[PDB]
Design a binder for this molecule. Structure first.
Ligand SMILES: CCOc1ccc(S(N)(=O)=O)cc1
Ligand SMILES: CCOc1ccc(S(N)(=O)=O)cc1
Ligand SMILES: [Zn+2]
Length: 257
């Protein structure tokens, strides 16, 4: 099974998922000087007021906070997107050290972690069908740096004790993801992929320029999670990030001058 260890990590994935060496893989380094301002890009529309969280799950690669996506309750639209994308889950990638952890980089800078809010295009009916389409998903990526605490993150941090190991889930209702957003919605955007297997090339990436701050204590609690299942040898869930992939024939666009 794929993972993030020495023997099953990102350099191994291509053997079972040949699209790993494809033409629009993610993440990438965002070269801020080469990204071009696109005045035709619209403001992002993030409508999370009726979001319904249900559950939080340790899936052995990260933890997902899952949402009820059976109605238009929490949607992303505008920006580079045509149509409406429904929030299905968010998760993070993070490091063993504050100096690494993000998947995207900015002028080669690595952040301590990266939040992915995952949305699927409602014109494809559900997530499973959407990932088979080039415009199936929109993932909103938000960088985390270590400094002041993020109050809106704390309810997530405090439930992690109950989902320490792979396969554990817990009820997680009434969580408001608006508490995880930075002030500015300025963004970079490019066509890419899932950053884990199956690495499908189905994502419009929207990466916010402004990081959020989280406390050292908050990210420390991320690092207490386990990749393993209960009763298996303990392997800390850290460094669950894929490194930057070749940009190839793509242009990253900026929403801002
Ligand atoms: C269990 C055999 O070890 C493996 C299994 C899968 C992979 S993958 N999916 O990264 O190519 C690597 C080593
Ligand atoms: C079935 C896998 O679903 C995924 C996998 C990866 C991502 S990410 N890390 O690109 O945002 C989202 C959904
Ligand atoms: Zn992700």
């Amino acid at each position: 099974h794929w993972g993030y260890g020495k023997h099953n990590g990102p350099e191994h994935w291509h053997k079972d998922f040949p699209i790993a060496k494809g033409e629009r893989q993610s993440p990438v380094d965002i070269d801020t000087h080469t990204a071009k301002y696109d005045p035709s890009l619209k403001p992002l529309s993030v409508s999370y007021d009726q979001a319904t969280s249900l559950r939080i799950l340790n899936n052995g690669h990260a933890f997902n906070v899952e949402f009820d996506d059976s109605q238009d309750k929490a949607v992303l639209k505008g920006g580079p997107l045509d149509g409406t994308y429904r929030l299905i889950q968010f998760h993070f990638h993070w490091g063993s050290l504050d100096g690494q952890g993000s998947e995207h980089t900015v002028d080669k800078k690595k952040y301590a972690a990266e939040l992915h809010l995952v949305h699927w295009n409602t014109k494809y009916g559900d997530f499973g069908k959407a990932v088979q389409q080039p415009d199936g998903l929109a993932v909103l990526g938000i960088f985390l740096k270590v400094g002041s605490a993020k109050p809106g993150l704390q309810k997530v941090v405090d439930v992690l004790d109950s989902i320490k190991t792979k396969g554990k889930s817990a009820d997680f209702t009434n969580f408001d993801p608006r508490g995880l957003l930075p002030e500015s919605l300025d963004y970079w955007t490019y066509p890419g992929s899932l950053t884990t297997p199956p690495l499908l090339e189905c994502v419009t990436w929207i990466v916010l320029k402004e990081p959020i701050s989280v406390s050292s204590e908050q990210v420390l609690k991320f690092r207490k999670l386990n990749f393993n299942g209960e009763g298996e040898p303990e392997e800390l869930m850290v460094d669950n990030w894929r490194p930057a992939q070749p940009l190839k024939n793509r242009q990253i666009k900026a929403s801002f001058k």
